[PDB]
């Protein structure tokens, strides 16, 4: 049929219990993740097609970018904790990869400030137990899917998206096929 194991998706040989329904891993240092978020808008388009009541989650990973990468995973935990993922995603991607103006923890904080998150609020979150828990949560999730690279997306901790099996000659077609696969898997 249209959808086929090994084509638009693969099946984890050891599924993850309690995983988020739709789980994307990315790194602000990853060029393909920059392509996913800034040119393809994968996550916005996936969200648009998700069935009623199925929600999507993004976690940041550390195996890219060294110490700054660890800071960016903690900053993303701040963004989840504060609900500002959509305020900071673009200036964090561009600051790391486009202008290369993000080179320290302080530079990341400046992005949150300029996006409306006051400094005292950012520091409180940065040093909070909630954020520590969210860092550990992101790391545990990637380990549980034996994550080896990004970007990556998993549905119900069972199925892994396989973009290499999709048509890449037209980006809008690729995005449509990617999002329709997430829709199909979420209903499976």
Residue numbers in the entry: 1 to 188
What does the report in the manuscript say about this coordinate set?
This 21 kDa periplasmic protein is a dithiol oxidase that catalyses disulphide bond formation between consecutive cysteines of unfolded polypeptides as they are translocated to the periplasm. EcDsbA consists of a canonical TRX domain, a hallmark of proteins involved in redox homeostasis, with an inserted helical domain.
The other three mutants, E37A, E24A and E24A/E37A/K58A, were crystallised in space groups P21, P212121 and P2, respectively, with four molecules per asymmetric unit. Furthermore, the E37A mutation abolished the interaction of E37 with bulk water. Overall, in the E24A and E37A structures, although water molecules w1, w2 and w3 were still present and coordinated to the remaining charged residues in the channel, the number of interactions stabilising these water molecules was reduced, with the E37A mutant also resulting in the water network being less tightly connected to the bulk water (bw1/bw2). E37A caused the most dramatic decrease in the initial rate among single mutants, which was 6-fold slower than that of the wildtype. In agreement with PilQ and ASST peptide oxidation assays, E37A caused the most significant effect among the single mutants, whereby it catalysed PapD peptide oxidation with a rate constant of 1.68 ± 0.12 × 106 M−1 s −1, which is ~26% slower than the wildtype EcDsbA. To investigate whether the water network had been altered upon the introduction of the alanine mutations, we inspected the DsbA alanine mutant crystal structures, which showed that although all point mutants maintained some of the w1–w4 molecules, their position was altered and the tight connectivity of waters to stabilising charged amino acids was considerably reduced. This was especially the case for E37A, which lacked the negatively charged side chain stabilising the buried water network and connecting it with the bulk solvent, which could contribute to initiation of the proton relay. We also found that this mutant showed the lowest oxidase activity of all the single mutants we analysed.
